[PDB]
């Protein structure tokens, strides 16, 4: 009763579904592509399934140095090649 | 629309089936359509189970619960529970699935198309809940139906091929039952047995002659009580004891179904006779006993004297005594010494496990059976990872016994809750306070204060 | 009519979601703590801080995803995005556990924003502020567990990680290392939580079963009108019922409802005090008199002594993988095990 | 001393139950 | 006669917009092999 | 790390010749191991006799050596004790006792090679986890 | 009136200070039997061989325990599910050694507590109330049946029932997690939601009612004297409370119907505790919580640990250590 249009009037209107039959799939597809292009891995730094370990490595790339942690990760990533 | 909203019927949408309490034609349709759902599931699940069923794996390794019921009734199985003919399983599924369409058609018909009440159409089919003599008549018809149903199991066992006998000489096999136990000191003796350990009440029934003879007694009791209820009206003490209403009769059934659900949970968990281990896997007790046996066999093959080996505590590592002196397996499985199974009974003597038979007479089929049962214990995770909670992923196994016991405990419990809900409500509704306290004659205000 | 008063007018407008001055704090901080949690659990690993996969992107499910704590080597660093550890690199900040501190700090300020909202709305509508006062307990729990506990410890690494199973690890860590079940402050917490759920169940059920018949429907919810002056249920009948069943009963509705505030709020405060002790390892780990007796009498056994052995198993079997900064190599022969298993 | 102390406190609680039930302030309708 | 854009509209879309994006991302993750 | 040819190259026999499995027969071997063997040999141990595992170093000291494909396949045809003194087909699953172990019935020679490949590859992947038991979980 | 009609009127009398009733004629002897035996056992019972391994555990105060460590120890593993009343023992000393008191207490208790539920139905009927307080009580009742009876049945021994003591309770919980991964079982998780939510809702409802109390008193007196027992008027302004809480969240999130609100307060912890009880009672048949141990594997096949894998290490530590002398074979099967 705060003056906004009721939700059950909006989502039953055709103008809402003209708009949202485009915006809702486009968002869903944009999320799908963030993963399937691999951009999600490069934005967040998450390992792909073949980038946890070097080929004969069994040890974990744990960060041990506070002020050079940024370099420890980069040295761990450069050992993935 | 008749009784299809809250204002006209007094019940909200979420109590919507209570609008059917006095509409016997729509209520009949609810029941017939729901019976169709049950028969549909039985049919659809069997065909699902059969479509997935690998004949070369045991049934219990395959997440099957209906195929074991059919195999236990004698269909599709040869010696040792091996499957020889998948076609009886196909028939049971198909015929259920087709009959569900007939029940579904008649349920939907009476629910939506036919007369809303039956009392104008027919005096035989219409009923009042308050009509005690009509209620016992419908009860009597249904008892006769159930009594014939018990005799069908007797008919299958005696005159139509038999039942799977896990205890049959030479291994489990489908055996025609020729001499069922008719003697009531045995049949009704099971009713008087303690439910506790070593006794087990009716769960301890361990031979098909007692199973079949009990079903003869139950079928004739149900037919006799069926006739009795058609011919009598509830006596005076019964009329003063019970609430006589639709919700009350529902509550009484809910109490009965809950009790039966709890009994089935124990049946599937402990009984390896009507739930043969070759179909359902080993029981919890059976697997634990199978482990002690397996390591007894291995260690004895290495040269160990098993009757004289001390465990860490001083009790015998492989063998010890029960609290009444019987020689039993040691370790934690001391709790399961009342386990009885066809793979283990040849090692038992008068005093329990016989040490000379253990030294000399364990066969390779018993060694294979013990190892198979130890590795198929009913322990697994909800995502069907077999073994203890600490196990790694690999084995995809949860025993049918675990699935059947857990499901039926859950169902029996909520049906107990439903009994309490409906029994309390039927009491209150009959006395007339189910909708609340009347503000004018509040009963507590007419009572003396407690202090 | 200055700019402050016009801004105050707009912030306090009747709308679908009330904003307020507290909403300036609450709404960004809550959105970021919530959004940071979903972002981290969807896309962010814990591989460099814990050696764990913790995201849907790596294959975890809702039970196993977490935004995990930073590495122990970070100490109690705020781990700001612009700080000396990430140096402005967002990708590295996520890899070092900067999302944990992001969620914890924005969660903290959001919780403040939420209690400020409770005060602001209660003041505007003209009710007393007991709901804000009751919210002090979840705040006390959040501050003690998520901030004071790791601040007492070596680093943020030992705080709870924001995940379902990660929290379960936190629970089992506190058993094995702190014997937290033995702690009388936790016990007071349990009593307040379980006593609170009991009061919730019993008060709801008592009201529903002493209702006055105020209408003709068998479904009785329609018989209530919020503008009625009359009590909807019989306090007198409820009192007589409980006095005869249990011996005692409420007879004052105001005391009843206060006691319902008091019980879970006091319990949560008590547990918070226990966790503050555990920040400094001031545990109620052992009963000295039983340990003296058990050491000298190898036949004395209790459930307390059995629990200590369980705790020793937890520590030894979990520490190498739970604390990978320590580089514990526990050879198989040093691990405590009973016979056979 | 310990055992006596625990039993003593317990026994007082049981006594308090007795007074709280049988010697409560009586609920009076007013 | 009602407005379209409100504080309510903003609050809805600050949640619903990333939610649908995240649901598409997580759906695509179901088809990643190792 | 990937599942390379060099990970998938296992000794074919005892003389010294190797075979490199494909990723498809590694994954069929893990599937067939799980179906036929993992109830007793989950993770490379042996639940019903823990003294003997499926570590390559234990398979090498068996008689005849089982640390190669041909040695492992032969065990699945005619299993023996660890010293090769007793044939144990009446209590261990094999093709000659496929009547009493019905999961052994339709296993082909390619299926036994796939299982044998999985047993030899898996320790190169898991290290001491394979055959180590709950200590390495 | 005959003596039976007079006795029945006494039993079902609403004028008795404590209501007896027909359930009460069972509840009263059973609960007194369980209480008396519990108190004596907790103070004075000698050590009990819980694990059946001649390794007796001291549970009573006189034998070295305090309030926190003391317990009535579960009956012996050698007994299993066997019924062990006093008459089955050759002497009280044997009954004590084997944990007889535990069976006596839990059996009388469960029978007594079941009749407490019936007695709650019974009085509500005599008072003209609606009958469903007893349904709410069925949640903790089911929980008690789960830990004292159903869990032992599925595990095959009353030695696996929860001990009657505080540290004994903790031992039961830790071993349960080791063996069943209860934390990863959704029924336990619903239990937690039931109890945290219940405490939350208890705090919320208490606080909102207290916040909306109508002024009838001065500052120098407790606001609780503003309510008179059995007054007809509402003592709080539910419209004010709805107006607050619907602005705290949003309007449609808040109850304006007190009957709906109180039903929710009933249903939330009750349904949650029912799921908790079913959790225990289904783990009684070893259908365990989710196992994700080694669920995450890299491209080579390396196990990548998750938080579930860290839980498993803790679970392993409890498992290898629990009942440290009782196991003779590699698998813990019951
Ligand atoms: C209304 C009236 C009812 C109330 C009135 C009071 C009634 C008292 C009833 C006493 C029941 C005692 C509980 C113990 C049950 C138990 O040990 O149950 C187990 C027994 C089976 O016992 C086992 O039975 C076994 C039978 O197997 C034997 O026989 C088999 C033959 O195949 C195999 O060979 C097997 O190997 C061999 O051992 C053995 O004897 C075992 O040693 C023995 O333990 O089940 C049983 O007898 C079947 C019944 C079990 C019911 C389960 C109760 C569940 C109730 C839940 C309540 C929830 C309440 C919520 C409140 C809100
Ligand atoms: C109230 C309700 C509302 C709640 C408000 C919402 C939250 C507001 C925001 C809170 C954010 C807090 C971040 C504090 C970080 C911290 O403290 O960071 C910690 C640092 C100290 O750093 C630590 O210092 C340690 C000691 O080092 C010292 O010793 C070492 C060994 O000798 C070396 O010598 C080293 O060089 C030397 O500095 C280690 O190095 C640790 O790794 C390093 O993290 O203190 C400092 O920043 C500051 C210390 C002084 C202020 C402390 C007040 C706050 C803490 C209160 C809780 C006390 C907890 C006690 C537990 C009980
Ligand atoms: C097993 C489940 C089950 C069954 C058999 C019923 C049956 C019934 N309900 Mg109940 N109900 C149920 C569950 C069930 N309900 C649930 C879960 C709820 C909560 C949502 C309700 C809430 C509820 C309310 C509020 C009401 C009922 C009512 C009714 C009755 C009349 C319905 C009607 O005429 O509407 C007409 C509906 C239609 C015409 C839609 C067509 C639906 C058809 C029947 C579906 C069948 C499809 C099937 C695949 C086709 C089979 C054909 C084939 C076999 C040949 C009917 C006897 C009504 C009543 O009691 O009135 C007196 C009523 O008011 N129900
Ligand atoms: C609980 C089961 C049940 C009950 C009590 C009723 C009762 C009724 N039906 Mg309904 N009906 C049902 C199921 C049921 N029906 C099913 C499954 C269908 C789909 C086939 C129908 C389709 C249907 C139609 C189209 C009509 C009725 C009618 C009637 C009314 C008169 C019937 C009569 O006098 O025939 C006399 C009965 C006989 C001569 C014997 C019955 C015939 C069958 C073949 C015997 C089967 C018996 C056997 C034990 C079944 C085992 C089933 C088990 C496997 C589940 C009566 C109220 C009529 C009506 O509504 O009037 C307005 C009507 O027109 N029914
Ligand atoms: C679904 C099955 C069913 C149902 C619902 C009924 C229902 C009824 N029967 Mg019927 N009856 C049935 C089957 C059934 N009967 C059968 C199969 C027979 C033949 C054996 C009979 C023979 C029969 C007779 C002779 C009488 C009834 C009567 C009645 C009415 C009252 C019963 C009563 O008070 O119960 C409650 C029972 C009691 C209060 C007796 C004491 C029970 C104790 C307290 C409990 C003992 C059981 C306990 C749980 C232990 C179980 C295990 C134990 C064996 C060790 C009620 C309408 C009475 C009637 O009015 O008929 C006109 C009556 O006289 N029935
Ligand atoms: C044969 C068994 C049986 C029968 C015929 C009835 C019949 C009735 N019940 Mg009862 N009830 C039962 C068992 C039964 N109940 C049990 C076992 C319980 C304990 C849970 C109850 C508890 C109960 C309550 C609390 C109430 C009733 C009510 C009623 C009446 C209306 C029901 C309705 O419209 O629901 C409509 C159906 C729904 C609203 C949907 C329910 C959905 C459930 C909760 C979850 C579904 C389970 C499913 C496996 C989980 C979700 C799966 C997912 C994949 C979708 C009707 C007389 C009402 C009443 O008293 O009327 C007088 C009422 O308030 N029943
Ligand atoms: C009410 C809103 C609110 C609050 C209280 C916070 C609070 C916080 N944020 Mg968050 N943030 C917010 C909204 C908020 N944020 C929004 C809307 C976004 C998206 C744009 C972010 C994005 C964000 C990121 C990416 C990060 C934070 C971080 C932080 C933490 C450190 C902030 C800091 O040190 O800045 C210091 C600045 C101030 C405190 C300003 C105070 C105002 C002064 C008194 C006025 C004078 C300043 C002067 C004019 C500046 C001139 C400088 C000149 C001399 C060169 C702190 C908990 C960091 C964190 O979480 O670390 C783990 C972090 O990495 N925030
Ligand atoms: C009333 C009502 C209701 C209900 C409903 C119901 C319950 C119904 C039922 C229904 C039913 C219950 C139905 C059934 C159906 C069936 C069918 C339809 C069948 C089919 C069959 C077929 C066709 C098959 C085929 C085949 C074969 C033969 C062989 C093999 C293969 C196959 C499978 C293909 C509701 C709730 C909704 C609501 C409203 C009202
Ligand atoms: C088949 C079989 C068998 C047989 C069996 C039999 C023979 C059975 C019977 C059964 C029976 C024979 C049963 C019965 C039951 C009963 C019941 C369960 C009861 C109930 C009751 C009640 C419910 C009541 C109530 C009340 C009271 C108490 C008071 C008053 C009121 C009233 C009435 C309500 C055997 C095991 C050999 C084997 C297997 C198979
Ligand atoms: C961190 C960060 C940030 C932020 C971000 C954000 C703010 C985010 C957001 C985000 C979000 C906002 C997201 C969303 C998501 C969502 C989701 C993912 C959902 C899901 C759902 C589902 C899954 C459903 C399900 C369910 C439930 C829950 C319950 C009921 C039942 C059902 C089944 C329906 C920034 C850049 C500022 C800065 C830097 C850092
Ligand atoms: C468990 C073993 C016993 C099984 C019992 C089953 C036997 C079946 C018949 C029993 C008869 C019960 O019959 C019942 O007896 C009582 C007491 O005698 C009668 O008498 C009763 O009268 C009224 C109510 O009617 C009561 O207020 C009064 O206190 C009582 O004497 C009941 O009205 C009658 O219904
Ligand atoms: O008692 Mn008590 O805890 Ca049930 O699992 Mn087996 O049994 Mn013993 O080890 Mn683990
Ligand atoms: Cl232990
Ligand atoms: Cl053992
Ligand atoms: Fe209230």
Author numbering:
A (entry chain E): 4 to 84
B (entry chain C): 23 to 473
C (entry chain D): 12 to 352
D (entry chain T): 1 to 30
E (entry chain F): 12 to 45
F (entry chain V): 1 to 137
G (entry chain A): 11 to 344
Quote from the publication:
An overall atomic model of PSII was built based on the highest 1.95 Å resolution density map reconstructed from the ARM-60k dataset. At this resolution, the features of cofactors and water molecules can be easily identified in the map. Despite the total electron dose of 83 e−Å−2 which is commonly used in the acquisition of cryo-EM images, radiation damages are found in regions susceptible to redox changes, i.e., the disulfide bond and the redox-active metals. In the PsbO subunit, a disulfide bond between Cys19 and Csy41 was observed in the XFEL structure, but it was completely cleaved in the cryo-EM structure. In the C terminus of D1 subunit, a part of Ala344, the C-terminal residue that coordinated to the Mn4CaO5 cluster, flipped out from the OEC and adopted an alternative conformation in the cryo-EM structure. The Mn–Mn distances refined under these restraints were 2.8 Å, 3.4 Å, 5.0 Å, 3.1 Å, 5.6 Å and 3.0 Å for Mn1–Mn2, Mn1–Mn3, Mn1–Mn4, Mn2–Mn3, Mn2–Mn4, and Mn3–Mn4, respectively. The Mn1–Mn3, Mn2–Mn3, and Mn2–Mn4 distances are 0.1–0.2 Å longer than those in the SR structure, and except the Mn1–Mn4 distance, all of the Mn–Mn distances are 0.1–0.4 Å longer than those of the XFEL structure. In addition, the occupancy of the OEC atoms refined with Refmac5 was found to be lower than 1.0 (0.87). These results indicate that the OEC is reduced by electron beam exposed, leading to the elongation of the Mn–Mn and Mn–O distances and some disorder or displacement of the metal centers during the cryo-EM data acquisition. In the cryo-EM structure, this water molecule was ordered and connected to D2-Arg180.
Photosystem II (PSII) is a multi-subunit pigment-protein complex embedded in the thylakoid membranes of higher plants, green algae, and cyanobacteria, and is the only molecular machine capable of oxidizing water by use of visible light in the nature. Water molecules are split into electrons, hydrogen atoms and oxygen molecules at the catalytic center of PSII, namely, the oxygen-evolving complex (OEC), through four electron and proton removing steps as described by the Si-state cycle (with i = 0–4, where i indicates the number of oxidative equivalents accumulated). The SR structure of PSII at an atomic resolution revealed that OEC is a Mn4CaO5 cluster organized into a distorted-chair form, in which the cuboidal part is composed of Mn3CaO4 and the outer manganese is attached to the cuboid via two μ-oxo-bridges. The overall structure of PSII obtained by cryo-EM analysis is very similar to the SR or XFEL structure in the crystalline state; however, the PsbY subunit was visible in the cryo-EM structure but absent or partially visible in the SR and XFEL structures.
